[PDB]
Design a protein around this motif. Structure first.
Motif, mmCIF file in Angstrom:
data_model
loop_
_atom_site.group_PDB
_atom_site.id
_atom_site.type_symbol
_atom_site.label_atom_id
_atom_site.label_comp_id
_atom_site.label_asym_id
_atom_site.label_seq_id
_atom_site.Cartn_x
_atom_site.Cartn_y
_atom_site.Cartn_z
ATOM 1 N N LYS A 30 0.769 -1.381 -0.093
ATOM 2 C CA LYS A 30 -0.059 -0.154 -0.071
ATOM 3 C C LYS A 30 0.915 1.248 -0.163
ATOM 4 O O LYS A 30 0.601 2.175 -0.700
ATOM 5 C CB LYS A 30 -0.958 -0.018 1.301
ATOM 6 N N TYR A 31 1.873 1.409 0.779
ATOM 7 C CA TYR A 31 2.720 2.398 0.765
ATOM 8 C C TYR A 31 3.740 2.539 0.231
ATOM 9 O O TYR A 31 4.729 3.499 0.623
ATOM 10 C CB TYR A 31 3.029 2.705 2.638
ATOM 11 N N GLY A 32 3.912 1.702 -0.630
ATOM 12 C CA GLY A 32 5.079 1.585 -1.591
ATOM 13 C C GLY A 32 6.346 1.262 -1.317
ATOM 14 O O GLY A 32 7.280 1.642 -2.110
ATOM 15 N N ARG A 33 6.376 0.663 -0.219
ATOM 16 C CA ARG A 33 7.638 0.018 0.052
ATOM 17 C C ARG A 33 8.338 -1.147 -0.579
ATOM 18 O O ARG A 33 9.284 -1.539 -0.559
ATOM 19 C CB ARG A 33 7.677 -0.263 1.804
ATOM 20 N N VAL A 34 7.548 -1.593 -1.300
ATOM 21 C CA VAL A 34 7.497 -2.502 -2.092
ATOM 22 C C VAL A 34 7.480 -2.415 -3.689
ATOM 23 O O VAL A 34 6.557 -1.839 -4.032
ATOM 24 C CB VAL A 34 7.371 -4.097 -1.832
ATOM 25 N N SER A 35 7.881 -3.358 -4.628
ATOM 26 C CA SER A 35 7.570 -2.958 -5.927
ATOM 27 C C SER A 35 7.477 -4.466 -6.979
ATOM 28 O O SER A 35 8.212 -5.299 -6.871
ATOM 29 C CB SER A 35 8.470 -2.063 -6.737
ATOM 30 N N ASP A 36 6.373 -4.253 -7.841
ATOM 31 C CA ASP A 36 6.194 -5.443 -9.224
ATOM 32 C C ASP A 36 7.507 -5.261 -9.728
ATOM 33 O O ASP A 36 7.490 -4.213 -10.203
ATOM 34 C CB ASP A 36 4.914 -5.024 -9.726
ATOM 35 N N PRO A 37 8.199 -6.281 -10.434
ATOM 36 C CA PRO A 37 7.856 -7.708 -10.140
ATOM 37 C C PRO A 37 6.384 -8.276 -10.295
ATOM 38 O O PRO A 37 5.501 -8.314 -11.297
ATOM 39 C CB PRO A 37 8.216 -8.014 -8.717
ATOM 40 N N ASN A 38 5.835 -9.260 -9.173
ATOM 41 C CA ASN A 38 4.739 -9.869 -9.383
ATOM 42 C C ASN A 38 4.207 -9.985 -7.881
ATOM 43 O O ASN A 38 4.935 -9.482 -6.856
ATOM 44 C CB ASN A 38 5.060 -11.425 -9.585
ATOM 45 N N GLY A 39 2.871 -10.172 -7.814
ATOM 46 C CA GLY A 39 2.058 -10.740 -9.061
ATOM 47 C C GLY A 39 1.090 -9.879 -9.497
ATOM 48 O O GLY A 39 1.129 -9.510 -10.614
ATOM 49 N N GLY A 40 0.486 -8.595 -8.747
ATOM 50 C CA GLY A 40 -0.460 -8.050 -9.147
ATOM 51 C C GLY A 40 -0.392 -6.461 -8.945
ATOM 52 O O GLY A 40 0.146 -6.107 -7.784
ATOM 53 N N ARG A 41 -0.727 -5.607 -10.041
ATOM 54 C CA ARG A 41 -0.386 -4.354 -9.896
ATOM 55 C C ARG A 41 -1.524 -3.247 -8.847
ATOM 56 O O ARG A 41 -2.217 -4.132 -8.617
ATOM 57 C CB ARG A 41 -0.327 -3.420 -11.214
ATOM 58 N N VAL A 42 -1.266 -2.192 -8.710
ATOM 59 C CA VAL A 42 -1.700 -1.356 -7.680
ATOM 60 C C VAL A 42 -2.417 -0.138 -8.287
ATOM 61 O O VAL A 42 -1.784 0.549 -8.884
ATOM 62 C CB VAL A 42 -1.059 -1.145 -6.464
ATOM 63 N N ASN A 43 -3.943 0.088 -8.039
ATOM 64 C CA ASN A 43 -4.307 1.545 -8.288
ATOM 65 C C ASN A 43 -5.093 1.656 -7.097
ATOM 66 O O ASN A 43 -4.916 1.289 -5.994
ATOM 67 C CB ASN A 43 -5.145 1.298 -9.490
ATOM 68 N N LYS A 44 -6.195 2.542 -7.327
ATOM 69 C CA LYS A 44 -7.033 3.005 -5.956
ATOM 70 C C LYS A 44 -8.073 2.067 -5.749
ATOM 71 O O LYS A 44 -8.191 2.018 -4.553
ATOM 72 C CB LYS A 44 -7.708 4.461 -6.287
ATOM 73 N N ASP A 45 -8.420 1.645 -6.537
ATOM 74 C CA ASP A 45 -9.584 0.304 -6.381
ATOM 75 C C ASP A 45 -8.442 -0.749 -5.392
ATOM 76 O O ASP A 45 -9.211 -1.144 -4.448
ATOM 77 C CB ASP A 45 -10.028 -0.243 -7.685
ATOM 78 N N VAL A 46 -7.411 -1.242 -6.136
ATOM 79 C CA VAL A 46 -6.865 -2.339 -5.568
ATOM 80 C C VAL A 46 -6.376 -1.991 -3.895
ATOM 81 O O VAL A 46 -6.582 -2.535 -3.043
ATOM 82 C CB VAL A 46 -5.598 -2.669 -5.986
ATOM 83 N N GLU A 47 -6.099 -0.569 -4.040
ATOM 84 C CA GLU A 47 -5.744 0.103 -2.760
ATOM 85 C C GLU A 47 -6.580 -0.018 -1.666
ATOM 86 O O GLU A 47 -6.339 -0.286 -0.491
ATOM 87 C CB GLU A 47 -5.136 1.693 -2.777
ATOM 88 N N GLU A 48 -7.988 0.081 -1.863
ATOM 89 C CA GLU A 48 -9.047 -0.084 -1.085
ATOM 90 C C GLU A 48 -9.395 -1.235 -0.507
ATOM 91 O O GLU A 48 -9.589 -1.610 0.708
ATOM 92 C CB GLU A 48 -10.199 0.691 -1.265
ATOM 93 N N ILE A 49 -9.269 -2.293 -1.544
ATOM 94 C CA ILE A 49 -9.655 -3.841 -0.738
ATOM 95 C C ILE A 49 -8.366 -4.157 -0.165
ATOM 96 O O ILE A 49 -8.639 -4.885 0.729
ATOM 97 C CB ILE A 49 -9.734 -4.821 -2.214
ATOM 98 N N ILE A 50 -7.157 -3.720 -0.402
ATOM 99 C CA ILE A 50 -5.868 -3.716 0.256
ATOM 100 C C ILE A 50 -6.391 -3.569 1.870
ATOM 101 O O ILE A 50 -6.200 -4.373 2.873
ATOM 102 C CB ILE A 50 -4.766 -3.305 0.081
#
Lengths: 127, 111
Positions: free
Chosen positions: B81-101
């Protein structure tokens, strides 16, 4: 274009936000959701989020692991739903539709979708 | 690499929650997602459901230190969520993903 139809549905006051919809769909596999609302929830995703793969993936698990009786209780035609979930996943995989809610179809995502596609293809939910 | 393909790893996690496959694999699975998929949220979300709805009974039997696992899942989620890590894999992040996270992080904290 069709960027119109999208601005319209997106502006729809009645549109369920995607994250609550995803949350509602995820409750189903644990038998804690509203299964009577599956058709409507599915209909909401085709309509408001035709480019999403995440919810169709979750629904695939619902179709996969639920029993025939359970599915026939809550869904009028289950094999038709199967075919629609399959169709939407296929649209995402081949880029017929874009901007998926689940995030970008990097390459891992396209593989998980292929796996779900297989699952659907291998499935027959007729009585 | 002995890096389990993401779809297979994700499938294994689903199976295990659906009572298929072998429960015990749980630690192995989480282990592997930490090691090979530090940036994925998909698997952590499924895992949260396992935690969320498994019984203390079941949990103790098959997971050594259930509550540490929780903290580790919660922490991979928070990294993503807070961008401490990066893809790679598996799944990318937007605002929608951010909220279900965040919803998952919410389930994890109320546990």
């Amino acid at each position: 274009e069709e960027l119109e139809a999208q601005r319209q549905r997106h502006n729809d006051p009645r549109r369920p936000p995607w994250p609550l919809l995803h949350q509602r769909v995820v409750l189903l596999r644990e038998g804690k959701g509203a299964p009577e609302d599956i058709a409507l929830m599915w209909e909401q995703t085709k309509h408001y989020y035709p480019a999403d793969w995440l919810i169709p993936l979750e629904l695939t698990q619902v179709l996969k692991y639920s029993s025939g009786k359970y599915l026939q209780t809550y869904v009028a035609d289950p094999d038709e739903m199967r075919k629609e979930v399959l169709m939407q996943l296929l649209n995402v995989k081949y880029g017929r539709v874009s901007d998926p809610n689940g995030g970008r179809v990097n390459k891992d995502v396209e593989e998980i979708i292929s796996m779900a596609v297989d699952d659907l293809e291998n499935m027959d939910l007729n009585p």
